């Protein structure tokens, strides 16, 4: 999963 | 402190009081004066006030009584029940039919105050309209993270358009709607328990909306009810920011359709991490999972579709979350690249937006 | 082993043999003779589940993860046709453009209940069971180290069946005839099968077969076949529960009995929850207080005619009678402060109730 800030 | 009223008249007010609202704070305060019974429950973060005409004889005075004990005796009583209530040495007694009851007080004095505040920002809205805004995004937000003003709601106002944003790092939800009134450019975030009581006062009548908004506290009046909650302090991610530059691969598709078959899929991805992987080509959408065990599911959807291949995995619930709140009839998802995030609306409509960022 | 189904043919067996190490998880799929043949078990209780096959199908057998299988199956479309196959160590399930390869473990693997001989049988109407176990249910322990309470008395007499639980607190008893000559005979079922049983009794016009043996129960309707163990120990007599002779008969209304003891309850102590009832000429007081000497009191019109009297008890023992009861009328049949009392519904002795008395 990776982040969006 | 003497009070007469039909049960019809109290139960609602009871109920909207009285969730959650250390001992005084599972009391509810009841000032009688100028023919209004009011009643107030808090937790010291915020506070719920309703207002009750007398219409029968009453006398003047304040105390404070165990919320719960007090709201199922008036609601255990039957239809049509006049209730009366009188204080008499520390305890308040109930009465209706021949049913008596005698509750335990605390002073009225004892009951915390929030502290004094002036409204800086004001504007009325349709009940529909907040719950509108809310419903769209409240599903974003974070549940307990360590970036507190996350696990709150963002409230914006900006030109004329009232902005609800919610998210937590992995996706967002962003949805704006139109007031007709002139807003200074604002921001505000409130706690989730405020969003949940915001919500809980929503009856569904005509009763329009009355927000005021100050630098720490939020207020909001509808009907003869008023909620103040604190606001959290922090630095909201900007929205803006994080919807997709130029998301110019577009695909559209059958909300329950498309909702059905992530649901299927989802049976069978990571029980964990939960990761479906998407294949778009020419009007089809090829979703798969698969897990630990080596089992495999594979749904295949007619979309319309016209740009370029490719292949990008998510979260399925963070997808179906989505789904589950549009309730659409056609969805459009809005692609960038395998490693961007995705912006997903309503085919019919742009008030709303949510942008979810994908999995390796 | 190969099938191929209608949704809903599926979804109701799956349900059922749901009911009861990795292979305990599967159900066994079994095709054979025009059959499907599911079967699921915790190694105490099994049920199983026949599915007439009219479409094309091939011998075989294995086991399959029940709840995703069962999953899969409720996720696709009202009607689609399901077509299941084993390929390897797979099975293959295929419904329109939709796929899924399930894990599967040997059928040779899933266990078998001993096999046992039927000692003695009866036919009766699913209704009658299901008024008898409903009747009862809620009275029976939980994981109380005196095993034998914490399951059901299936009792033979006569030409009635009879129902016991019991907590060794509160008892629940319910006989109904089933016009069959029947030996004097009992046994116990343990509360997991209790309730398998209760939730296999769909509320159609198939009748119900019983068949007893020395360690084991099994009940047929149509398509479903139950079969437990039974609890290997001694139950309680419920014949020295029963107040002997109580001579003091009261009558009331039912909802209006229950929302006075729901009214009242509230300023019970709540660990102990005594209530007290004064009984005088059509006429009953109840009253309750807690630690906290907050009072209840509820006056009511009820029919009485005998001695005046007090006594208290649990009034959550009490309520979980009229809730089962769900009558029009109540007979409480009282003897004195230090006796205990028989509650019924006042249009019928097929279910009786009794609850201790408290000195409160
Ligand atoms: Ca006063
Ligand atoms: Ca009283
Ligand atoms: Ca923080
Ligand atoms: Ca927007
Ligand atoms: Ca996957
Ligand atoms: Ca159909
Ligand atoms: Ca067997
Ligand atoms: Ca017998």
Same mark, same amino acid.
Request: charged share 25%; net charge negative; proline share 5%.
């Given at each position: 999963?990776?982040?969006?800030? | 402190?003497?009070?007469?009223?039909? +049960?019809?008249?109290?139960?609602?007010?009871?109920?909207?009081?009285?969730?959650?609202?250390?001992?005084?704070?599972?009391?509810?305060?009841?000032?009688? $004066?100028?023919?209004?019974?009011?009643?107030?429950?808090? #937790?010291?973060?915020?506070?719920?006030?309703?207002?009750?005409?007398?219409?029968?004889?009453?006398?003047?005075?304040?105390?404070?009584?165990?919320?719960?004990?007090?709201?199922?005796?008036? @609601?255990?009583?039957?239809?049509?029940?006049?209730?009366?209530?009188?204080?008499?040495?520390?305890?308040?007694?109930? +009465?209706?039919?021949?049913?008596?009851?005698?509750?335990?007080?605390?002073?009225?004095?004892?009951?915390?105050?929030? #502290?004094?505040? /002036?409204?800086?920002?004001?504007?009325?809205?349709?009940?529909?309209?907040?719950?509108?805004?809310?419903?769209?995004? /409240?599903?974003?937000?974070?549940?307990?993270?360590?970036?507190?003003?996350?696990?709150?709601?963002?409230?914006?106002?900006?030109?004329?358009?009232?902005?609800?944003?919610?998210? #937590?790092?992995?996706?967002?939800?962003?949805?704006?709607?139109?007031?007709? /009134?002139?807003?200074? %450019?604002?921001?505000?975030?409130?706690? +989730?328990?405020?969003?949940? !009581?915001?919500?809980?006062?929503? #009856?569904?009548?005509?009763?329009?909306?009355?927000?005021?908004?100050?630098? =720490?506290?939020?207020?909001?009046?509808?009907?003869?009810?008023?909620?103040? %909650?604190?606001?959290?302090?922090? @630095?909201?991610?900007?929205?803006? @920011?994080?919807?997709?530059? =130029?998301?110019?691969?577009?695909?559209?598709?059958?909300?329950?359709?498309?909702?059905?078959?992530?649901?299927?899929?989802?049976?069978?991805?990571?029980?964990?991490?939960?990761?479906?992987?998407?294949?778009?080509?020419?009007? /089809?959408?090829?979703?798969?999972?698969?897990?630990?065990?080596?089992? !495999?599911?594979?749904?295949?959807?007619?979309?319309?579709? %016209?740009?370029? !291949?490719?292949?990008?995995?998510?979260?399925? %619930?963070?997808?179906?979350?989505?789904? =589950? $709140?549009?309730?659409?009839? =056609?969805?459009?998802?809005?692609?960038?690249?395998?490693?961007?995030?995705?912006?997903?609306?309503?085919?019919?409509?742009?008030?709303?937006?949510?942008?979810?960022?994908?999995?390796?």
């Amino acid at each position: 999963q990776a982040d969006l800030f | 402190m003497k009070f007469t009223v039909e +049960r019809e008249h109290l139960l609602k007010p009871l109920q909207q009081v009285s969730g959650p609202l250390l001992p005084i704070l599972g009391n509810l305060l009841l000032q009688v $004066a100028d023919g209004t019974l009011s009643l107030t429950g808090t #937790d010291l973060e915020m506070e719920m006030v309703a207002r009750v005409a007398l219409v029968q004889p009453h006398e003047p005075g304040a105390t404070t009584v165990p919320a719960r004990k007090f709201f199922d005796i008036c @609601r255990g009583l039957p239809e049509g029940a006049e209730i009366a209530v009188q204080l008499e040495g520390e305890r308040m007694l109930v +009465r209706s039919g021949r049913s008596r009851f005698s509750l335990s007080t605390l002073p009225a004095a004892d009951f915390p105050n929030l #502290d004094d505040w /002036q409204s800086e920002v004001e504007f009325t809205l349709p009940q529909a309209t907040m719950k509108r805004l809310i419903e769209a995004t /409240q599903f974003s937000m974070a549940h307990q993270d360590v970036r507190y003003y996350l696990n709150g709601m963002l409230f914006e106002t900006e030109g004329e358009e009232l902005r609800t944003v919610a998210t #937590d790092g992995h996706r967002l939800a962003v949805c704006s709607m139109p007031i007709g /009134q002139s807003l200074p %450019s604002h921001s505000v975030i409130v706690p +989730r328990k405020g969003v949940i !009581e915001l919500m809980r006062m929503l #009856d569904g009548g005509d009763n329009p909306l009355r927000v005021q908004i100050g630098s =720490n506290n939020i207020r909001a009046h509808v009907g003869d009810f008023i909620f103040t %909650s604190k606001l959290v302090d922090g @630095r909201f991610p900007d929205y803006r @920011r994080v919807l997709p530059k =130029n998301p110019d691969k577009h695909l559209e598709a059958g909300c329950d359709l498309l909702k059905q078959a992530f649901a299927r899929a989802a049976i069978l991805s990571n029980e964990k991490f939960r990761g479906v992987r998407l294949y778009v080509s020419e009007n /089809q959408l090829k979703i798969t999972a698969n897990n630990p065990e080596q089992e !495999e599911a594979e749904e295949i959807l007619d979309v319309t579709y %016209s740009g370029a !291949e490719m292949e990008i995995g998510f979260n399925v %619930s963070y997808v179906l979350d989505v789904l =589950n $709140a549009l309730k659409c009839e =056609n969805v459009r998802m809005m692609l960038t690249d395998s490693v961007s995030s995705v912006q997903i609306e309503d085919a019919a409509s742009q008030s709303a937006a949510y942008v979810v960022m994908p999995m390796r």
